Amino acid sequence: SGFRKMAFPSGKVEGCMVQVTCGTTTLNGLWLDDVVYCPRHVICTSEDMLNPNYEDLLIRKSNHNFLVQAGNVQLRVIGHSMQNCVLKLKVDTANPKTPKYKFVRIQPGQTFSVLACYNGSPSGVYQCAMRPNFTIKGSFLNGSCGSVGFNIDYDCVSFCYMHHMELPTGVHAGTDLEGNFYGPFVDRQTAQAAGTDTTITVNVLAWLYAAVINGDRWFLNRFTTTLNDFNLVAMKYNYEPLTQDHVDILGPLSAQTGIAVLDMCASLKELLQNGMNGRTILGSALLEDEFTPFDVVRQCSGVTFQ
Amino acid sequence: SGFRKMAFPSGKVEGCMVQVTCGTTTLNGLWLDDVVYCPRHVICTSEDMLNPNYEDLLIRKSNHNFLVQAGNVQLRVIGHSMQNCVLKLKVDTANPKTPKYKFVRIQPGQTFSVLACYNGSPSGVYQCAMRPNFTIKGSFLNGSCGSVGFNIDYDCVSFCYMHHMELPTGVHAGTDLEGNFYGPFVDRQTAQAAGTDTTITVNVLAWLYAAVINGDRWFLNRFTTTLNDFNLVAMKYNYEPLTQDHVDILGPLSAQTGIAVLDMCASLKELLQNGMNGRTILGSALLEDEFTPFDVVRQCSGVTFQ
Ligand SMILES: *[C@H](O)[C@H](C[C@@H]1CCNC1=O)NC(=O)[C@H](CC(C)(C)C)NC(=O)N1CC[C@@H]1c1ccccc1
Numbered sequence: 371s372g373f374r375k376m377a378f379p380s381g382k383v384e385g386c387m388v389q390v391t392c393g394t395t396t397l398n399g400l401w402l403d404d405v406v407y408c409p410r411h412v413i414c415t416s417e418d419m420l421n422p423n424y425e426d427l428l429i430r431k432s433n434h435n436f437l438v439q440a441g442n443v444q445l446r447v448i449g450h451s452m453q454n455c456v457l458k459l460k461v462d463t464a465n466p467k468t469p470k471y472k473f474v475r476i477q478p479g480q481t482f483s484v485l486a487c488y489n490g491s492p493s494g495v496y497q498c499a500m501r502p503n504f505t506i507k508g509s510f511l512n513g514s515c516g517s518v519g520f521n522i523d524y525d526c527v528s529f530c531y532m533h534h535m536e537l538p539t540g541v542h543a544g545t546d547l548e549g550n551f552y553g554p555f556v557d558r559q560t561a562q563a564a565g566t567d568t569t570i571t572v573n574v575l576a577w578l579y580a581a582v583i584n585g586d587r588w589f590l591n592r593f594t595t596t597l598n599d600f601n602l603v604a605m606k607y608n609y610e611p612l613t614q615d616h617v618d619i620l621g622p623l624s625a626q627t628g629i630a631v632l633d634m635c636a637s638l639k640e641l642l643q644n645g646m647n648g649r650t651i652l653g654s655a656l657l658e659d660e661f662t663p664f665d666v667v668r669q670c671s672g673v674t675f676q
Numbered sequence: 677s678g679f680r681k682m683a684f685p686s687g688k689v690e691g692c693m694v695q696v697t698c699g700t701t702t703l704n705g706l707w708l709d710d711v712v713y714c715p716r717h718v719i720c721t722s723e724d725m726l727n728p729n730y731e732d733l734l735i736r737k738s739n740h741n742f743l744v745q746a747g748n749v750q751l752r753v754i755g756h757s758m759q760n761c762v763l764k765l766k767v768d769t770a771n772p773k774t775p776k777y778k779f780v781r782i783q784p785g786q787t788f789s790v791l792a793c794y795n796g797s798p799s800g801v802y803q804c805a806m807r808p809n810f811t812i813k814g815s816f817l818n819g820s821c822g823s824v825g826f827n828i829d830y831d832c833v834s835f836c837y838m839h840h841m842e843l844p845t846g847v848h849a850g851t852d853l854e855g856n857f858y859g860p861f862v863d864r865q866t867a868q869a870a871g872t873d874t875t876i877t878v879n880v881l882a883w884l885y886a887a888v889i890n891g892d893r894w895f896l897n898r899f900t901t902t903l904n905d906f907n908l909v910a911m912k913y914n915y916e917p918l919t920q921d922h923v924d925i926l927g928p929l930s931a932q933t934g935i936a937v938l939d940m941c942a943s944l945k946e947l948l949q950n951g952m953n954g955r956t957i958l959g960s961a962l963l964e965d966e967f968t969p970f971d972v973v974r975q976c977s978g979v980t981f982q
């Protein structure tokens with residue numbers, strides 16, 4: 371038993387991380403087969419990052435302007451090109467540690483693990499959610515760009531995120547691995563801001579189920595509610611609406627605990643109207659929304675990856 | 677910026693994990709050079725685990741009773757012996773992925789990363805603290821025994837923990853890598869229980885510094901306090917006493933923020949007497965005590981590992 375914010379094991383991704391240097395800018399790259407992926411702003415200087423013309427800046431580079439470093443070994447760049455907001459650096463060596471992988475784009479509400487990296491060297495791993503406003507609440511300092519987010523499915527790594535920038539409220543913005551930003555952000559220095567966020571209702575419910583599986587039951591109640599009456603309360607507290615497909619996805623958790631989904635909604639309603647009254651749920655005094663129904667089943671049943 | 681519960685990258689440890697089977701018991705082992713380490717209760721059956729005589733049980737085994745599996749490759753056991761509560765299984769192949777490592781025992785209050793494993797296959801990674809009562813609040817199911825906890829120091833892996841059992845309150849107990857339990861627990865089925873815990877005061881203070889570094893300042897105050905008067909309040913709220921060495925260790929964080937350690941103590945005192953009043957600190961509505969001063973500096977300054 372127990373419940374923790376759990377990341378995927380990171381070894382398969384660690385073997386792909388390299389350091390990309392252009393001019394006086396160094397960030398991280400992701401090396402798969404004979405291509406290195408990295409944020410395109412590696413080609414900018416300090417005054418470039420104001421309002422750059424990336425096509426203009428790239429036509430003025432050649433292969434030898436890109437220093438790529440895989441540990442203590444230099445990778446020779448033999449071609450380069452831009453794909454939306456990422457660069458693709460063709461190198462003369464295929465990565466022998468290339469895992470089976472996919473490039474997939476995720477939905478707000480889904481989770482993934484981040485391998486934070488500096489100078490091509492991994493620094494730490496943690497679990498993140500894509501917020502409804504397409505930001506993530508990460509931990510990123512100077513030099514961390516090019517770090518990636520991923521999920522693991524048996525032996526296959528689904529890369530979903532590449533880091534690019536921090537917004538004024540201290541939250542983070544990036545692209546999928548085809549270089550397309552999550553949300554309405556650009557890789558320039560403008561006055562861009564996050565945009566109002568909501569709480570991921572389906573995930574809170576899944577986490578309430580994790581609590582029941584782990585022995586926290588004090589918030590359970592005999593009342594029930596219709597889906598419509600629950601969604602009237604969710605709107606009032608800035609929670610996003612719950613749909614019948616969310617109810618269906620909570621089916622397995624409902625059946626393992628014997629608590630009907632709409633009954634758990636009634637519990638959440640009371641928690642929203644009364645608060646917690648000095649108690650905690652799974653070590654938290656807030657309602658947690660960064661575990662999916664899948665995360666709960668995975669952890670509360672013991673699935674591995676090979 | 678940002679602050680997250682961050683684990684070390686796990687790849688160096690993933691390459692050491694194997695599956696150890698004896699009879700109908702399967703758990704995890706740690707394979708370094710030509711030795712596999714695992715919990716000694718792998719040799720017990722269901723009725724054995726009541727009140728076993730492990731020396732008796734081990735003399736009745738031979739090498740061929742231990743099936744060791746490194747992925748899809750079987751490791752031949754050529755010797756075995758008991759070291760306190762772990763078995764050492766000598767195999768005919770040295771692990772080619774053996775990192776530089778040490779076996780070190782930690783203090784209550786220090787942190788480490790756990791690589792949770794089933795059937796020799798890693799499942800997830802997360803950060804833990806050794807509680808003052810020598811338990812850890814983990815996430816462990818059947819089959820997870822033999823999973824290890826570790827820290828990384830540049831390229832060297834300091835193994836500090838091997839998992840053995842869950843206690844009645846849902847918390848977890850294990851040994852260091854020489855097989856000696858943390859705390860007053862035994863590897864038998866008895867009525868053993870955790871024992872009353874305390875809050876790790878020095879870590880709460882470090883986390884308050886992390887908050888200030890990240891822009892949460894609402895809890896700061898103009899008052900100060902003597903160390904003695906703070907420790908009178910800490911005792912009342914089940915916090916452990918703060919020593920002059922703790923103050924010294926908070927020096928660097930004090931100097932980066934400009935907030936004297938005893939001033940931050942005065943802030944903690946007010947937080948203990950008044951609570952939070954509906955506000956949060958680094959996304960938490962509780963005072964968090966599972967980050968060390970080192971964890972805060974590491975994350976808020978960007979140290980990597982190679
Ligand atoms: C690439 O390593 C960095 C990652 C940033 C640095 C601080 N935290 C991060 O996540 N990305 C940038 O530096 C990015 C460059 C472009 C303007 C070209 C997109 N800029 C920012 O992230 N900026 C400029 C304001 C924000 C920032 C916040 C906090 C500290 C430094 C910068």
Ligand SMILES: *[C@H](O)[C@H](C[C@@H]1CCNC1=O)NC(=O)[C@H](CC(C)(C)C)NC(=O)N1CC[C@@H]1c1ccccc1
Pocket residue numbers: 371703717725816817818819820821822840841842843848862863864865
């Ligand atoms: C080795 O894989 C397991 C790990 C346990 C299983 C559930 N959570 C864990 O952390 N260790 C044991 O099964 C251990 C064996 C000895 C008695 C020989 C030490 N026993 C327990 O951990 N037990 C028996 C009560 C507690 C338990 C709690 C919850 C579920 C199952 C067992």
